[model samples]
Target: MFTTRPTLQGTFGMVSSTHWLASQSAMAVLEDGGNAYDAAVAGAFVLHVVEPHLNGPAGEVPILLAPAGGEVRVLCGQGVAPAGATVAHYKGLGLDLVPGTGPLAAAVPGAFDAWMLLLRDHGTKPLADVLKYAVGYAEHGHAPVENVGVTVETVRELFETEWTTSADVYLPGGKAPRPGELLRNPTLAATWKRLLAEVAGAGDREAQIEAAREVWRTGFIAEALVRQARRPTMDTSGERHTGTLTAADLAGWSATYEAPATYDWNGWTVCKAGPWSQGPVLLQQLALLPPELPEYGSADYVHLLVEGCKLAMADREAWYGDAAEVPLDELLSAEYNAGRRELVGDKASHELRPGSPGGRTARLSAHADLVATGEPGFDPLGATCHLDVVDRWGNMVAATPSGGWLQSNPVVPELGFPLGTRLQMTWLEEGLPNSLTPGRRPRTTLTPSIALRDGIPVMAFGTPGGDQQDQWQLHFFLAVALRARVRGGLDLQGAIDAPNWHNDSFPGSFYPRGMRPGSVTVEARMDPGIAAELRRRGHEVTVGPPWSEGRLCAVARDPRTGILSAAANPRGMQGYAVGR
Candidate 1:
């Protein structure tokens, strides 16, 4: 196994995140005596500030964690639609799909409550203590990365014309700040301080955090959102449409805990959030692959993965959603996977093929004829962010906090955060699991991964590539977990540093969903022979630069030795890992 960077080793704890500031924030909490839960909560808030292009305060998150002695569970932050959000409402507005960008697509905000709940239950620190790092960065300043700067620049005209409030906040001095410059968000800082101030003379630690959640749900935060919903905002539909969210909607919702979906493979049990996310897609892929995979980086290995991904993703479209009966149990069964595995051939699949389960018909959403309705600042390679942490006590957490990107929608003037457009993932048609149903969560792409060996958690890892999230993670897992028995097996850093690829053959999860039949992109660092072979198999292969792919971060623990290890991707030059 080879890696350009060394795996970080430590005896106490380790924190790895998509941004250096976030990693540092988590490490600060650990050093200050907080556990993995507290550090993750702290790091998540800082990510809202530093990685504004990727996530924000009002976004949703789905966190997977394992307490030292407790079973694995998911703290679901994925918000559901308001009561008024329904297929009829959108169809009346002539929408076939929810608009990708604007107030109309906003779900009830959930990130704030999610973090507070995690802090109150699993964490040992006060809300203020966990939030101080983020507040400081927002108030004083933090160096804005090139990605954020580029995003703002790409949408500069849209901001100046349609979203003036966004321009005021993002464009200081009426211009986008250059990359690496000190950037501050006084409004966001003020919002945090106001929450703190509202609970200044409150009860004990838990009560204080509960008070913060109240402020966000029923107080000024909710009031501001309700006000924003009253007026129509610009969306991808090239029209202004009012949002359906209300203060009641926010007050009605709070994050909850649920059992994780688990799959066993080669002595390692991979755990992920339930079907509301694309998490189970990874488990389904694992089941499709042979226990003894072909040699790493071999053309056969890549073909197997790409074909498996296409099958699993197609099933995601047909059955995996916020439905009451998703057939998930049947989907992951050995018989179902064996039947689906027959679809993979020596050639690339150019069509969507969802499998039948329990003798029930699999009805997939009809794919529309390709019409590229380009959004103002759409990044063809858009993605979210991920972080993983492990504490000295063996507690572990892997959270993918995303949605409500600054570019997803306009910023709310009073709240100082953008509303998330997660609703865009739902369709307006009936009978589909991902249809626009009031109070139902949209199927999300924010999936986090954790694996346990022999009932003891060993690895927590994930990436930030929208549809590619599981794809890239699957590649890493095959190298690290499946190959764990091999001599000199790839360590955390080596697994993360390995070249990655993904097939874009399936319809995308974002707005203006598009598909490229038989198309696959791989890092040029991979053997050219593999690419040529893939081409021979009727795939359209595109070569990307070396180290141009995943923004992956991972942390693992050796249960016997109590030694912790961590790694971060070098692709964006922002991810970092820190440990004693």
Candidate 2:
């Protein structure tokens, strides 16, 4: 086996996530009679508490799910720009790009309502039961990971000088907590307790959940956010900005379910959210490539995958967004893919080429001139978290909960959290798919994956990297589905443990949207021979730390036997998988 640890197998259930406590929390819920959806909700809430640097209550999420016998659907928790948020307003500030940090980048908070929607529509447990894990962790304490400490330390000066509320939470006793320290957020705990208190006698489960949602949108949380929006805060631009988001925006918006964009390859169907997310890029990438591949980590295999991703991501920048009329049907069609596939040659192509679809010309965003370079290594502000779960009943879920990192904006004291800066993904220049517009969701980078075999749910997988999420997921999927079964007798964990790499050839979705032409970042754990070959093929290779690429987690099920299996990333040494 390629893995250091074996894939956990069971017939009962499985849970794997970016953090050990989150995984254990979900497993506990499953063992206590909750379905996959319920367990996912519980784990998601706990993630909000524990991985605060990565995600929080004020964040957004995009969930892909498959109930036991139901069709795949996307729970679109991504929030939209506020009513007053317009390109003119941002342009008036003399900015070409949205500031990656601060309140001006805040979108309507959508994650809480989305989780409630999932719980109300599909789950059996009450809101209190699902949120208890998070509340307990926040009230008592949870051991903070090394990443949490590092993130805080990076932003310590900013917190101390500008975002004092954030300093109050992250820096206990005027100092950043040491890694593995038992840190508590009593203010956050009080916030959740108050939410729970509001639903004490709301009658049924749905009503109670509704009460919590109302409290979030119209009550304390809303009041604090509105109060804070009037005050200016420091942003990445080194200037102060008062946000346009308001209570009315939160009140007017809620999360909703939509049909997933899907593609069929080799008898397995992969499902992702609409173009509003970068999810469809995965489908388009699959459409452009051949059905099978060479052995994993081979130079030819790596080159093909990297080149394919560049083409797909180029389209994402050009046409995939909420407001723009994306010709997705044409993009995923065989004729269009075959035409695009011709662009990939023996050598790596660094050009950003988005193809024409259905006689329509592609219009690239105008912010290309404002490219900002991201130095290779850990970025404290580039935050997201992912989780996967499979219940005994065959219900499966894959969710990427992201945005609203602790460093995004100062904590709204009354609510004990800040709003998400997801709007940064939108462009200020007009006429592009991702142009800034009122009431439109930012083209989110949070894409979760769910694959079904012959109409039966088989797998749920995801990772936490801005533009790299789908890229890493594609690599994991290839190893688990095609290479493991066809080339090697490796299991799920083996596939997860396989060395990973990604092409940074497209304009990034995060702040300072820079593109490194012909760049491919690979783990040092990958074979040196293959790495050297990649360089020979005109690729600018960056050999990253041995275990640094992705925080991927996955859960799989065998339709014929009802057996389940799960695996978590070993990169950060925090993610875990739990099953019988």
Candidate 3:
């Protein structure tokens, strides 16, 4: 049971991966008299040097920003498969999804394009000045953080799988660097310098921005960044699968700004980044849970939460797809969510719901086979950073930056960071609603989310763990939203990482073998006696070690820790915050 006293003013940020590129950027902004949005950009670019393993310029980034003025907008940072891509292409190769290597896996990276779009729309500084930290660190390098160490240790073999530009940048000295090493990325620095010079020499700031845009559009810098990040090499026959990212594809790539989906629980509102990620499912979880469920890590509480999570996830698997293609409005409606909520009951058994209509498992459910033959649930481990900001101006920001899994693209030369492997999130089967298609966005688990009170932010939070992103985001929401004892409370970071447990009893979002409904997995903080009690209820129970599963770092500024009392998961290597 975790509880904290409310603070009049608080700011908190957590970087999931080694790079808090954007998280750090946001922090610097906070120090520099800037707002949350400005700091977010700073942290995003810094990632190139610090957390290059997961996200980068050529990847995708979706954002949700609610200023003090009550303006909430979502930047559609995801890009589609190029026109050169098609279901026929994968079918021709006897595959349903793009192979993780070569041109097939590459989509015009959308993150940079979207970043530029955001700057053009909301920013007040020169692109060069705004991205100065990223450019400097990427090119010159920074200290190797814990996130980097963990990524290298976990994915060393993946880096060695083939000759890639990424392997060159990350595997510097041909090994994983220890923590505190003064890592350098001279090539990245040079590239950033060039991009800056282009913007500086332009006629005006906008022109300068355009010049730098050309660098991204023409893949001038992106290629160099990839080459340095991955350090690609020629084969004996001088062949490669690194990719050909032409200026046409780069220039043509666009970011589609869309409205986020929202779900209400108790009296609070949960708003999510749009279709690019598993964001919308947060609402579904809230819809499925019993309002009377407990808020703490108790047996009954954990059971309902997990069951709600499963049902929400299964709905996502069935009804979720690109908003541009799917009737997202229908799925995101309050009516639909309320309709689904009636399905959860006090019954303690596990059962699978076949589709959006609640078809039985034995029926001709379109997704039954896919659900039955589930893949390992979120098999890959990932690195990311989260930020929960509540400014003095009544503004709020909850964001998650993810990367540091296996590189999806061959590394761009001169840049030490690898492209995002987020493409694998899309299912490969053709004709399926979420089946891979050219110009179709891949479904994601990287959901940066928030909860609102009286139309103002009460909670700002998010985390790592691909599929678990939505489940956990909403769980934290339930802790505060449904619990009566909490009022006028919390600074965020502290509340999220407290000892917690998850119930698997509800329908699973994405099913795999061995996962049963009503299953409750908990952190070791729970006493064995409690664990036994849970098991007696026919709940399969597994206790996560101090930092088992993954680190559980959380931040909440209370009278106890004052300005900020943060707790990194005991099993977590490290956790900290830079705030006033």
Candidate 4:
């Protein structure tokens, strides 16, 4: 199969990311004697510097990793709601919805400690070694992707009026930087450098990393975040609101390792983060489809694929949350999927449908209907970023770190990044599984994926499109599965380069949430006839430009053969895959 770019191959290590700079930076760490975990941390920090508009330090990142000869595990970095973040408290502020772009919608920061914990436990490189690249880039300069210019332009007005500190950093010289202009965030660089100095005397790698964890959880970083949360800020709600986070909330939470949610699919074992995230929805969508699927890119294929997503997404809206019980066992059951699969037909359905698992009732918040009726558009506040790394030792990792977009909130003047608005994903009503609750993680849409075939860990992959993260990654994985089924050579780049589509009919996961019933967007490069066929079947088809969809990145390994190959998205001309 032909591809837009060569699928890289090597026996040493591989790194793939949405940006070429991040990929190359991660590869540098691997070349300098770091493991998969260490390489990922290095690359992720670069993403913050180059793609600051999309992601930053104070974000939630759910990571899935497998150590050599070890069981697959998930390091959950999604921060929980603050102690004062109660349904009553939000409603008392005359709010029926959490504002999509303010501190009022913040969750605790989690990505840093997650990276630290992984580096400390599984990596061989020292903290300073893995961090120098990002520090150098941020303090000196790096040519960022053009999206940074576009993002800054989008928020420049807000920055000048309200987020003045952001104005100082992003709107330097009192205007958006030209596309491809060299940029630097000296404040962020100083923050990282100072942390290193503070922990210099902490002795060994584990102790220093542990000490740095405390730096974020209970020290100056926590103090700054808490102080900022108390100040009222303007938001999408067209009013000022103060955040609920307190110092105790930051001290109370840290990234923790947990068992992955798994499902067996056609000789492949797919693993993802648990119900606390939308990860399980991917497993559920896989369950609803038959082992033998329609030919890729056919009208029949898109029809079947998207219909499966609607039902699964509906379930997420109704049942998938960080509650005491999510009925995951029953939802992924073959018997249950057999019944759910019956709902899909030749026609595109417009209803929000979620099947009963364990005969439990399914319900949505009262605002869902009202929200769904509004026009659907891209979320203006932010998006996400992804990275995948594989080393010669058989260790593999897939991570999606997001939130804390420059638009999500006012930048912490000292920390140089904004707080994430993930709490906006929670409902203000009581009794729902995803309602605003004190000290509970938000039901995030940041899902990363790993796959094992014949009991040998083989691949780590994911994307960054908010709710579409799983939807886009699903297409990439299925392409791999299809090739494997035919016993043909599997091309990672071809899978990522293939025309992709997604349904925007379900309620969106981000704030200012809405849905467009029966709507589907397919790449313009898709067969012209397929779009017509899709329209005939009642899908409101929007033809997107070629290479305009997902920011997918993937890496695969054959443990016995020791051949590692990587691929990244060519869309936006940014993503890269680097290896021997």
Instruction: Kindly list the per-residue Cα lDDT of model 4 for residues 178-297, writing each as its tens digit.
Output: 666678889999989988999989999889999999999898888888888888888988888898889888998989999999999988999999998999999999999987888876
TM-score of 3: 0.81
Please list the residue runs of candidate 4 whose C-alpha ends up more than 4 Å from where it truly belongs after superposition.
Answer: 371-383, 484-489
Cα RMSD for candidates in order: 1.9, 1.8, 5.3, 1.8
Worst 10 residues of 4 by lDDT: 374-383
Give per-model TM-scores. Answer: 0.97, 0.97, 0.81, 0.97
lDDT of 1: 0.86
- For model 1, where is the 10-residue window of minimal lDDT? 368-377
- Tens-digit lDDT string for candidate 2 (78-126): 9999898899999998888898888889888888899999999999999
Rank the models by lDDT, top first: 4, 2, 1, 3
Predicted candidate 1 versus true structure: per-residue lDDT over 158-226, tens digit per residue: 799998889989986777857767888889999999999889778999999999989989999889878
Stretches off by above 4 angstroms in model 1 are 368-377, 380-383, 482-490
Write one digit per residue (lDDT tens) for candidate 3, span 196-232: 7766777775676666667776656655533433333
What are the clash counts of all predictions, listed in order? 0, 0, 54, 0
List where candidate 2 sits over 4 angstroms from the true fold.
Answer: 369-378, 381-383, 485-490
Error of 1 at 564 (Å): 0.3
- Model 4 / residue 127 / CA error / Å: 1.3
